Structure formats: structure tokens, C-alpha cells
Amino acid sequence: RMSQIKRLLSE
Amino acid sequence: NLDRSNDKVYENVTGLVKAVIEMSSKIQPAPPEEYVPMVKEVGLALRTLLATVDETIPLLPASTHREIEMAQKLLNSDLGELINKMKLAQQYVMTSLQQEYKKQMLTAAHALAVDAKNLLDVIDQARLKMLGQT
């Protein structure tokens, strides 16, 4: 959920 | 890889993704006077994003235009779909269903972010092509 977008957020 | 120092697309996609994240983290505790503004805030980010892309298109090879425009199509679609759920959740404020409609907002926004992320991917592939990457 939260954790999923939060990674791709800073690549 | 790519220098992002003045990549407007990348900033605009970041700021739209942050907007979805912001809304999501905030949504549950939140009444309509708080959660409508944040959706506005997403939409605005989205438009800023599509405008930038419109300016970039003509700089990128011909063969990639279709695919992008479609990724743009989609983003609007997603936003629409998020507003629908937004309106539903407002209809049913302080009722049994409030929360389960906020769920379908979260689903819609997570779609939007995913698709914006995908749009960014397309653009890159386009630049890389146009920049002469091997």
C-alpha cells in the first residue's frame, strides 16, 4: 500500500 | 543515469507522486473540508504535469508520440475516476460507509501515481532514444 509507492517515489 | 538537474517532467512527476502520497497518509482521520483540497492539489499537479509533457513531445522522436499521448489519456482518466470516488465519499460522510469509500479513493490515487510513474518511464525511453543512447 503506502510502502509500495514510497520506494518508487525516490528512484 | 540521466541528469535530472532541469528535468521538468521528472520534477512534475515527483511533485504529483508526492501529492498522492500526502493525500493518502492524511485521508483516514479527515473530513471533506480537509480531503477535497488535497485532491485539488493532486489535480493541479497533474495539469502542471501534462502541460510540461505537451511542450516536450515535439522535442522527442516521432515514433514515441502515440504511446505518450495514450499515457496522458490514462492519467486524466485516473483523475476522473478519483474524483468520482471523492464525490461518493462526500455523499456518505459520517455514515457506516465513509471509510470503505475512502478505500476506493486510495485505490484510484495509487493508480494515478503508478501511471504517472509509467509516463515518466516512456518519456525517458524517448529522450534516451533522442539523445543517442546505445
UniProtKB/Swiss-Prot annotation, chain A:
Tissue specificity annotation: Highly expressed in T-helper cells. The presence of CD4 is a hallmark of T-helper cells which are specialized in the activation and growth of cytotoxic T-cells, regulation of B cells, or activation of phagocytes. CD4 is also present in other immune cells such as macrophages, dendritic cells or NK cells.
Where would you find this protein in the cell?
Cell membrane
Q: How is it modified after translation?
A: Palmitoylation and association with LCK contribute to the enrichment of CD4 in lipid rafts. Phosphorylated by PKC; phosphorylation at Ser-3 plays an important role for CD4 internalization.
The domain of life is: Eukaryota
Residue(s) carrying Phosphoserine? S3, S10
Please describe the quaternary structure of this protein. Forms disulfide-linked homodimers at the cell surface. Interacts with LCK. Interacts with PTK2/FAK1. Binds to P4HB/PDI. Interacts with IL16; this interaction induces a CD4-dependent signaling in lymphocytes. Interacts (via Ig-like V-type domain) with MHCII alpha chain (via alpha-2 domain) and beta chain (via beta-2 domain); this interaction increases the affinity of TCR for peptide-MHCII. CD4 oligomerization via Ig-like C2-type 2 and 3 domains appears to be required for stable binding to MHCII and adhesion between T cells and APCs. Interacts with Aedes aegypti long form salivary protein D7L2. (Microbial infection) Interacts with HIV-1 Envelope polyprotein gp160 and protein Vpu.
- Free-text note regarding domains: The Ig-like V-type domain mediates the interaction with MHCII.
Q: What does this protein do?
A: Integral membrane glycoprotein that plays an essential role in the immune response and serves multiple functions in responses against both external and internal offenses. In T-cells, functions primarily as a coreceptor for MHC class II molecule:peptide complex. The antigens presented by class II peptides are derived from extracellular proteins while class I peptides are derived from cytosolic proteins. Interacts simultaneously with the T-cell receptor (TCR) and the MHC class II presented by antigen presenting cells (APCs). (Microbial infection) Primary receptor for human immunodeficiency virus-1 (HIV-1). Down-regulated by HIV-1 Vpu. Acts as a receptor for Human Herpes virus 7/HHV-7.
Provide the disease association from the record.
Immunodeficiency 79: An autosomal recessive disorder characterized by childhood onset of recurrent and recalcitrant skin warts due to uncontrolled viral infection with human papillomavirus (HPV). Some patients may also have recurrent respiratory infections. Laboratory studies show a complete absence of CD4+ T cells.
Q: What is this protein called?
A: T-cell surface glycoprotein CD4
Q: Which organism is it from?
A: Homo sapiens (Human)
- Its gene name is CD4
**What fragment of the full-length protein is this?**
431 to 441 of 458
From Swiss-Prot, chain B:
Q: Which domain of life is it from?
A: Eukaryota
According to the UniProt record, where is the region Interaction with ARHGEF28? 1-134
User: Outcome of mutating L119S, per the record?
Assistant: Loss of interaction with TGFB1I1
Q: What does the domain comment read? A: The Pro-rich regions interact with the SH3 domain of CAS family members, such as BCAR1 and NEDD9, and with the GTPase activating protein ARHGAP26. The C-terminal region is the site of focal adhesion targeting (FAT) sequence which mediates the localization of FAK1 to focal adhesions.
Fill in the subunit field for this protein.
Interacts (via first Pro-rich region) with CAS family members (via SH3 domain), including BCAR1, BCAR3, and CASS4. Interacts with NEDD9 (via SH3 domain). Interacts with GIT1. Interacts with SORBS1. Interacts with ARHGEF28. Interacts with SHB. Part of a complex composed of THSD1, PTK2/FAK1, TLN1 and VCL. Interacts with PXN and TLN1. Interacts with STAT1. Interacts with DCC. Interacts with WASL. Interacts with ARHGEF7. Interacts with GRB2 and GRB7. Component of a complex that contains at least FER, CTTN and PTK2/FAK1. Interacts with BMX. Interacts with TGFB1I1. Interacts with STEAP4.
Q: Which residues form a coiled coil?
A: none
- Source species: Homo sapiens
Per the record, the gene is: PTK2
Instruction: List where in the cell it is found.
Output: Cell junction, Focal adhesion; Cell membrane; Cytoplasm, Perinuclear region; Cytoplasm, Cell cortex
Family under the similarity heading: Belongs to the protein kinase superfamily. Tyr protein kinase family. FAK subfamily.
Found, by tissue, as follows: Detected in B and T-lymphocytes. Isoform 1 and isoform 6 are detected in lung fibroblasts (at protein level). Ubiquitous. Expressed in epithelial cells (at protein level).
Q: What does this protein do?
A: Non-receptor protein-tyrosine kinase that plays an essential role in regulating cell migration, adhesion, spreading, reorganization of the actin cytoskeleton, formation and disassembly of focal adhesions and cell protrusions, cell cycle progression, cell proliferation and apoptosis. Required for early embryonic development and placenta development. Required for embryonic angiogenesis, normal cardiomyocyte migration and proliferation, and normal heart development.
The known PTMs are summarized as: Phosphorylated on tyrosine residues upon activation, e.g. upon integrin signaling.
According to the UniProt entry, which disease involves this protein? Aberrant PTK2/FAK1 expression may play a role in cancer cell proliferation, migration and invasion, in tumor formation and metastasis. PTK2/FAK1 overexpression is seen in many types of cancer.
Residues that the record marks as modified (Phosphotyrosine) are Y10
This one is known as: Focal adhesion kinase 1
